[PDB]
Amino acid sequence: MLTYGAPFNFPRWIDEHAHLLKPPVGNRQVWQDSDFIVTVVGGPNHRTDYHDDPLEEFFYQLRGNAYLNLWVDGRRERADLKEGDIFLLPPHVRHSPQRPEAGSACLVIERQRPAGMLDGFEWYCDACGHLVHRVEVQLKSIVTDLPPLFESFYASEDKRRCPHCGQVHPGRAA
Amino acid sequence: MLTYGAPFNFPRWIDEHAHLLKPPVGNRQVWQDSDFIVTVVGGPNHRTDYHDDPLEEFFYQLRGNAYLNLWVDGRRERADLKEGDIFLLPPHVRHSPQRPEAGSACLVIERQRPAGMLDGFEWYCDACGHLVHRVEVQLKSIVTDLPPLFESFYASEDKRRCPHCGQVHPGRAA
Ligand SMILES: Nc1c(C(=O)O)ccc(Cl)c1O
Ligand SMILES: Nc1c(C(=O)O)ccc(Cl)c1O
Ligand SMILES: [Fe+3]
Ligand SMILES: [Fe+3]
Ligand SMILES: [Fe+3]
Ligand SMILES: [Fe+3]
Numbered sequence: 001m002l003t004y005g006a007p008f009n010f011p012r013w014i015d016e017h018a019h020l021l022k023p024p025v026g027n028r029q030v031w032q033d034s035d036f037i038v039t040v041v042g043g044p045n046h047r048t049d050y051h052d053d054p055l056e057e058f059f060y061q062l063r064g065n066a067y068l069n070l071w072v073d074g075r076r077e078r079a080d081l082k083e084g085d086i087f088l089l090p091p092h093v094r095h096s097p098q099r100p101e102a103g104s105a106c107l108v109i110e111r112q113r114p115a116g117m118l119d120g121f122e123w124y125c126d127a128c129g130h131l132v133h134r135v136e137v138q139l140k141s142i143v144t145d146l147p148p149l150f151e152s153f154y155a156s157e158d159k160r161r162c163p164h165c166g167q168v169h170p171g172r173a174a
Numbered sequence: 175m176l177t178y179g180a181p182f183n184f185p186r187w188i189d190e191h192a193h194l195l196k197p198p199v200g201n202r203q204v205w206q207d208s209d210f211i212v213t214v215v216g217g218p219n220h221r222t223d224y225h226d227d228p229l230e231e232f233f234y235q236l237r238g239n240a241y242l243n244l245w246v247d248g249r250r251e252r253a254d255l256k257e258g259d260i261f262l263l264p265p266h267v268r269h270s271p272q273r274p275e276a277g278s279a280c281l282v283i284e285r286q287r288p289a290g291m292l293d294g295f296e297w298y299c300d301a302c303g304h305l306v307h308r309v310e311v312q313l314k315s316i317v318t319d320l321p322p323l324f325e326s327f328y329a330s331e332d333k334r335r336c337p338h339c340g341q342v343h344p345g346r347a348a
Contacts, residue, residue, distance in 0.1 A: 001264075001267075002253075004262040004263075004264060007233070007235075007254065007255055007259035007260065008260070009256070009258045009259055010258060010259065011258055012258075030260070030262075031262050034230060035229065035265075035285075036230050036262060036283070036285075038260075038262065055209065056208060056209050056210050058283065060281075072176060079180060080181065082183070084183045084184060084185055084186075085181035085182060085184065086182070086184040086187075086204070086212075087181035087182075088208055090175075090176065090177040090178060091209075107234075109232065109283060111209075
């Protein structure tokens, strides 16, 4: 049987749920309990963290523009997701999704992580560039599991303290 | 490093490769050697086979319309993929993609099958409805591996012979 229901118009779906895409992630999962985690992400979002996904991530910026702050070969790079662009991110490439425009929508598809395969969430110092804090988690929901982690980083100067130059990461207002 | 390159406009990509989407599958893979097998499928295609995919399949009919002939709970059903529709197919639900219109384009995303996880390709009798022939394969390319299988079924009346009512499946002209 069609465990996930019948086909349906995606634009309309997005229009009807536009109001539910809210910060910090701007996340919204289409189907529940599937192997393919299919989501729509809108803006304005609020991310200061770099995600280290053990699996690939597929992107398709359907509406508006956004960009990904990356760490490619040890360098802070930027990959723009112009409306209409698709992109496949290899596993583990660190990325921080910046989606500043309202009414924006990006199709993001990922995979359920097998038990034992953890996702990493990191922060880097804006001063020396050194890694400030890393949290590894067995992710069960890219929708609900994210904010709580960010909250604990923002609420702790000890976590935000760079082990290289003692500079304390801005946190919530970064 | 970005093993799969930078982001790029998808519509333009589709426009520039429209001429390469040819029967019987109408297949065209976007990125090579990735875990997520991302393809675009256009028409007119030619499929008489039902695919039994051990993993989920994501669809997003970007241009034109198409439909999926299915076997849901033992019944020949039809799921229309109207332009703009997205759909997630559970593992193993038998399906036969019908894409009759030229200039059509559907984003289809699937997963690389682990070793030992085989795909099944089946044919059913238009008379009694009984299973006529099944082939299991360790799929390495949903692009190049398909036609050869279909060819061997079409070239054999023995394979096309229904084990229930001796009716011989039409084959190439079905
Ligand atoms: N790429 C993302 C995004 C995004 O692109 O906005 C949001 C949540 C998660 Cl878990 C991601 O991996
Ligand atoms: N759904 C498809 C399609 C399709 O939808 O046309 C083509 C090839 C393969 Cl291997 C598929 O699983
Ligand atoms: Fe991510
Ligand atoms: Fe520092
Ligand atoms: Fe299939
Ligand atoms: Fe028969």
